[model samples]
Target: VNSFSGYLKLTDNVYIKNADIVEEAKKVKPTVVVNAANVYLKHGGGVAGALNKATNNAMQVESDDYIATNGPLKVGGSCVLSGHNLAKHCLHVVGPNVNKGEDIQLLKSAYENFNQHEVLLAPLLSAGIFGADPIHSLRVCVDTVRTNVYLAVFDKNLYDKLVSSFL
Candidate 1:
């Protein structure tokens, strides 16, 4: 699903991918888990493919809190349900194409939510089909989240860059 070519590494010891999250979290016997929202479901080309890459543990709570909101929020709309999904929650945030600032806003909201809670299990930003540059999207994601942010990337290079920047 990733368009760019790169490597992935955890320089600062942050867990990478859903499998890592599940493995690490299981060791602690967590009571609650939180996941970030995604755009594409079974459509949107690359996004659909990325969703398929998620592990079983990550997919289990994919439909818990489904919030339907527009990209800019000013352009209100209804939740575009993806038939019957499995996640425990879903939050829909609308936004313009890569040129617009909607993507950054989405990351901002997700980070804010994470701050409100103690533990969060969120999907990496821009892991969906938006037709934008994946690297830029990932940068925004890293900037939005806190020090304890845990994420996954389909592109190995993107993961590497994240680790390099953070560490």
Candidate 2:
């Protein structure tokens, strides 16, 4: 669940950035963030990795125990709030398990209808590590739907790569 990000016009209080989600968090100080996460909340990979770092590695082990009974946060589903560090709170969405092949529906299903008043950050869900079709997933509004947190931080030179087309 991840990679460069955006949705809506930059003028609409939205801007896409390809920089480190953790570092940018230091600047934006987002009050919230959306991570392409599973119910496990393991914080060992993708979004969890950043969160583990941001929260000073405080919540993962406990989270793992908590979601053990729930199977995984099914595709399109999300769990909001828990423990946080940098900004304040967190939103975890169950992005498609790409090993299952393109779950385009994962785009529409992941983190739907949740909007924030502050600046949000997210990766191009299913477009990274999970190995989904990057270009197509990028166009899916998958980027737009998964917007922000007490924060959603990232890394590297991007933004336009993910947002310009949508813009």
Candidate 3:
């Protein structure tokens, strides 16, 4: 029932997949859905944009409240979720700043810092705006999880990059 056409097996339970993040999330029907995030909750572009549209900007309002109260989150930080149809539990990880050659440690830290029990799903962090190479970005996500991990290489260009890299 996985919708993706291609996959990278990170473990018996983990995979890097070529598909839409939200679509894959919907299929997995997880108890929690995790997505890439910003400190300001700027859900305007990339997967963030799609999540905003998917959730009716409910996360936007909740994130705004959380950010205003807690101040900006540091790299590799995260926040839990509030309102969404997919699952009651949601989380946003402030993943690496790959454009700046962000510390891979921070990328791994973000994943390790997260504590959730579900079929966890995440996008290729920093792959879009931060321009991280999707191949390596996929590994960072894969190596971070201890349970069922589903990753979405949503961008067509990124998907092709991973596919060709494997071949």
Candidate 4:
């Protein structure tokens, strides 16, 4: 197995104020993706948000049809920790201020079940008002993943800082 560790560093406070989800998927080219559903929606909430709002929907979209047509999995609950749809398999963890230890456990469980070539994606922990600081969030996220997996972050500054620390 290829073992590697590094940090992504950011020069300024980054926010996903207007992130492009479809573009992000194209950039990553991942077969499987994971995310914190709540924070992702709060930040971008793109087409998925529109669909839900119009339909008054409250179900986690989990089919190739949705991913191909609507967008990536933008709605999920704490119970449905992860899923695979179309070109991506997603692992969803809930948190604004998730207990560090508990978060690790959940992530470990999910990682054990995930396949190779899957990219684990998530927003910076506490990127919302819940105050889960970026550094602490990174620690938990990094520690939980198995070696050789890819992580994609939207916040460029945070991603840069993380890369620096890892090197």
lDDT of each residue in 40-148, candidate 1, tens digit only: 2222233232332444424423333332222322211113222123232322333223444454445445444444433333345444443455555555555554544
Q: Which ten residues in a row have the lowest lDDT in candidate 4?
A: 9-18
Winner by TM-score between candidate 2 and candidate 1:
2
151 in model 1: Cα distance from truth in Å? 1.2
12-98 per-residue lDDT for model 2 (tens digits): 333454556666555555555666675466677776687677777666765676577565666767775654654565667666767
Between candidates 2 and 4, the one scoring higher on TM-score is 2
- Cα TM-score per model: 0.44, 0.71, 0.81, 0.46
The lDDT for every candidate, in the order shown, is: 0.38, 0.56, 0.70, 0.39
Tens digits of per-residue lDDT, candidate 4, 1-167, equal: 22212323232212221233334444554454444445233322433343233223432443333345544432212323223221244444345334433343343343333333333433443443434455655565455544334444556776566655641
Model 1 Cα displacement at 28 (Å)?
Answer: 9.1
Residue pairs of candidate 3 with colliding backbone atoms: none
Number of clashes in every candidate structure? 22, 17, 0, 18
Off-target runs (Cα >4 Å) in candidate 1 are 1-106, 131-143
129, model 4: CA deviation in Å? 4.0
Off by over 4 Å in 4: 1-22, 39-86, 96-123, 165-167
- Name the candidate that leads on TM-score: 3
RMSD to true structure for each model, in Å:
8.6, 5.5, 3.0, 9.2
For model 3, the stretches where C-alpha displacement exceeds 4 angstroms are: 1-8, 163-167
